[PDB]
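so i finally got all the pieces together for this one. its two components total, 877 residues if u count the protein bits. some of the lines might not be protein, just check the labels. i wanna see the whole assembly predicted at once instead of chain by chain like last time, that was a mess tbh
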Amino acid sequence: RRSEVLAEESIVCLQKALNHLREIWELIGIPEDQRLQRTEVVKKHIKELLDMMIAEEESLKERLIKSISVCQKELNTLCSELHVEPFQEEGETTILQLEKDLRTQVELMRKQKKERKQELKLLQEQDQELCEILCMPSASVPSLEELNQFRQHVTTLRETKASRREEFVSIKRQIILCMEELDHTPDTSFERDVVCEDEDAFCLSLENIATLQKLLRQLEMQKSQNEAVCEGLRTQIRELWDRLQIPEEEREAVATIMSGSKAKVRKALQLEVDRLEELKMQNMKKVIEAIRVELVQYWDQCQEQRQAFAPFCAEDYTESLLQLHDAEIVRLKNYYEVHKELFEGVQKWEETWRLFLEFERKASDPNRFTNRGGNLLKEEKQRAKLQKMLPKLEEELKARIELWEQEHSKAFMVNGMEYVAEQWEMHRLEKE
Amino acid sequence: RRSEVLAEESIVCLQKALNHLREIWELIGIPEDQRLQRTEVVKKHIKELLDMMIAEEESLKERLIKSISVCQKELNTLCSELHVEPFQEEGETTILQLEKDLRTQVELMRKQKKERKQELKLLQEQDQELCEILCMPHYDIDSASVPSLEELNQFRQHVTTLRETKASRREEFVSIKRQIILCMEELDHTPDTSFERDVVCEDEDAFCLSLENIATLQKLLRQLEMQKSQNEAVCEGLRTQIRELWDRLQIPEEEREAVATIMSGSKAKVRKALQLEVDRLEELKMQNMKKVIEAIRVELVQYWDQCFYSQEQRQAFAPFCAEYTESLLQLHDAEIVRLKNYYEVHKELFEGVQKWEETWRLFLEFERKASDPNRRGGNLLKEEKQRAKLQKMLPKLEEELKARIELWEQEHSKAFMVNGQKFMEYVAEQWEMHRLEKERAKQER
């Protein structure tokens, strides 16, 4: 209602213009023909202009419809690449507005397509990283369900990753504890990257996990070994504590050696076992030697025969050789205990003969009246008493030797009564 | 009425186009605003084109009217400058044809002015050529910035008259030049001045035909005519002299015919010729009169010798030695006539006078032969006879002469003395010597 008014206005203007021109031509005076020519020129140019306008607007219409075709097809495809219903049913098919709608919706489809494709790439990247660390391994225009499922997959991978990382952390902690306990620094490459490196850069494959647990198994095996060896040494020490005096205070002093599995406590155990065993051993040598001293004591009271037994020679001193010498000394003491009343007479007789011979000697020296001790009758009478005891001693002890030979078969010797009677004969030949 | 039809037709065309665009709008879904603005632009360009064309045409019209006014003004200016009626036509009441015709008259009258100017300059360029030769102004009022038909006609007539008069005066120039050339050819007088050179030596087209110049030419002709009159006169005097000297002496018609054949006019060196002849005649005459005189002189002396013995008496003639005026000749005539008749009267007397001596010498010879020392020639007796005859003859003449002398001396004169005083003393002396011869002879005997 406004464009029509403008149009009629323009037409009116053209009318007034034509009137004015015709009036001018009339005034100047042009014989119709050239007026008709001029008007034909005017109508020509105006025709040109108007046809130009019309052609322009027509080509605009062509632009609009072609646009509509292209967008129609493209949207028809983008409703297939995705799963969205095509918008329509407004009721107003104003081609400007309709084209605007198509173009805009298409733009949106492009946008969400690019967004979903990009998201696909990103999820593929995350999946790549997770498949890379856990060691557990087209692509264009997806949907939405595929996306969700993929997201679920990724989340599961992340959760399992967290699990493996926690487990690895704990096992690494325990492993550090072990390697410290055993006084051990990382040597093997895997042990190095597990303990020294760590930092979660350590791969969390099933391979690495199994290897890890294996290493832990080895370590705990070692710790168990050490505790077993050491405790065994401890029981040996107990055995040494029951087979000896061992006052409480020394047990208390050792009580730190009954500790753990550490090499120093082990070496301590060894040291103590060695030292205690050697100690007891030295006690064996000692006591055995003492028994031998008692033996020497009783040998004189009772040479080849004494040499016959002697097994103590050499360094082997134990409870074995101990009981050997103990049994022997007991037997010997039991021998002399029964034959004391026989040997005492031998000693007494030897002494008697000795001082008798002495008194005989002092009674022969012609310078006894010049160089001697007082009381001549004392020495003489005492000597006579010795000469009285001597045969009766040889008599009273004569009925014992035969009895011994009756009990103990064979004969008895000493230092090689034969020698006794030989001594008597020596005396009888001395005064000759 | 058809232009309006095509106009409204084009209007319907615009309506159709606008409805077509409205249609095109309806075909699609287009708002009011953009269509309104586009229609507004259409209106803008339509108004633009219309205003443009209407501006061009309006301009053209107002320029046409302007040009009309200007051409009318200029037409009035040129109609005032020259003298032409402002022509037009009432039928053409239109603007276009009016303007066109106006500037047409403009260009035409401009051509008229230019033509008149060129004609003016032409007439001036002929005038300048002729007036210089005529040595006169002959300039009209003649404004070099203003022309006029009648004045142009007057100029034409003026120039043509100048041409006619030029041809006339030049004709006179040629005629007089010819006459002068002839008179000079006869008088033989090569131009000694510069003007004569300007006439005959400078030749044609260079003569300044001023009236004074022509007067000088006439003056030259009068000079040649003058000298011609002089020479004609001189030669007339000479002519008369020749006929005259002819008449004085003997004039033959044969020799006169010869001179006539030798005779000419008064041209060249005829004066030198005739003169030479005049004096020649004067010489001839001079000889003639002399010759006669010479002859007469002889005769005089002859008649002196036949009478006059005294040299003084002969010298008493006075002029005789003088040398030839008519007076001298006539004087000789009178003298000799006088002497001739004077002698003729005394003819017999002087004859006897000579006869006396003629007989005396002879007689003395006969007497000398009479002494006769030789005693010679033949005839002695005859000689004696004739001697006696002479002796008888002498006294007859002696007394005769003595009387004639006495008769003559008595009345006619006073005295006389032939060959000295006492004319007889010669006679008496001869008689004395003869008497001496006789005395000597008589003494010898």
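DSSP finds 13 helices and no strands in chain A.
Chain A touches chain B through 48 residues (CB under 8 Å).
anyway lmk what u think
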